[PDB]
Design a protein around this ligand. Structure first.
Ligand code: IOY
Ligand code: CA
Ligand code: ZN
Ligand code: ZN
Length: 275
């Protein structure tokens, strides 16, 4: 897999931050900052050669969107998906939650094109709408995915909050092959990981219908323990993300090392699991 350039990931976050500032301070469902986020991500993918689909839904009386990006080629009967919700709460720009996962998934998708990669499995990336309303976009996607296509899914990889400023390194303990792939990457860095327990994100609708899932998380409102600070640094007794769902979830609310490591791990897993 290629090494995902941290600066490119950060640049997507800068664009999402400006989009929020230009649209009332947020990127929330039903508000113009969300569709503008979709338009940014979609244009990058279209230019890179993806076949993109805007999947529209209505929730709360307002139109929502998922952005689906299929990399042409690969076995139609073995589809590997990776995704991240692209909406924020309305209090702020949602840069860690979840610009971080959105940007890492986008830069991984662009990296496939830059590398000239032809995965054996068909790759499909997703940016979900309305996660903050209760997983509404990912539920809509799974609910509208015919059973014959659901059975073609080899896995769904989720990235929701992966740049927390006081990070832990949590790996979902779901499908064993996907979990092993992420843990192996972190082992190569000599960075310990722990099982995610802090769940409720967009892998749940996939998990609940039997699709193998996994993912990465760096912590939210829970406090980092003394033992977690000893293994990962940062500040014991402070939240992993002190700006969770806040107006201060801005460009300053990112740990660059965690963002880099989790972006690189995302690419490692997508390459490994698609051969
Ligand atoms: N508000 C949730 C926080 C959250 C993220 C990831 C997991 I796994 C569990 C919880 C979000 O949108 O990121
Ligand atoms: Ca990197
Ligand atoms: Zn989130
Ligand atoms: Zn959230």
């Amino acid at each position: 897999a290629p090494d995902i350039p941290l600066a490119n990931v950060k640049a997507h976050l800068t664009q999402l931050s400006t989009i929020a500032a230009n649209n009332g301070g947020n990127r929330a469902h039903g508000r113009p900052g969300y569709k503008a986020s979709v338009d940014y991500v979609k244009a990058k993918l279209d230019a890179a050669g993806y076949t993109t689909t805007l999947q529209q839904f209505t929730s709360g009386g307002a139109t929502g969107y998922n952005l689906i990006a299929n990399w042409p080629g690969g076995d139609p009967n073995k589809v590997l998906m990776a995704g991240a919700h692209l909406d924020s709460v309305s209090s702020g720009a949602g840069i860690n939650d979840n610009g971080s996962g959105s940007a890492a998934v986008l830069e991984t998708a662009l990296a496939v094109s830059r590398a000239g990669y032809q995965p054996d499995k068909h790759l499909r990336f997703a940016w979900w709408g309305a996660e903050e309303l209760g997983l509404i976009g990912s539920k809509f996607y799974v609910n509208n995915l015919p059973s014959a296509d659901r059975s073609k899914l080899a896995g769904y990889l989720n990235f929701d909050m992966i740049g927390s400023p006081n990070p832990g390194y949590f790996v979902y303990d779901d499908d064993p092959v996907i979990e092993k792939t992420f843990k192996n990457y972190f082992a190569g860095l000599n960075v310990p990981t722990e099982i995610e327990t802090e769940g409720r994100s967009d892998h749940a609708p996939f998990k609940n219908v039997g699709v193998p899932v996994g993912g990465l998380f760096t912590g939210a409102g829970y406090t980092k323990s003394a033992a977690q600070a000893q293994k990962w640094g940062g500040t014991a007794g402070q939240a992993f993300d002190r700006c969770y769902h806040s107006s201060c979830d801005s460009l300053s609310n990112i740990n660059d090392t965690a963002l880099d490591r989790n972006s690189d791990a995302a690419a490692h897993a997508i390459w490994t699991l698609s051969s």
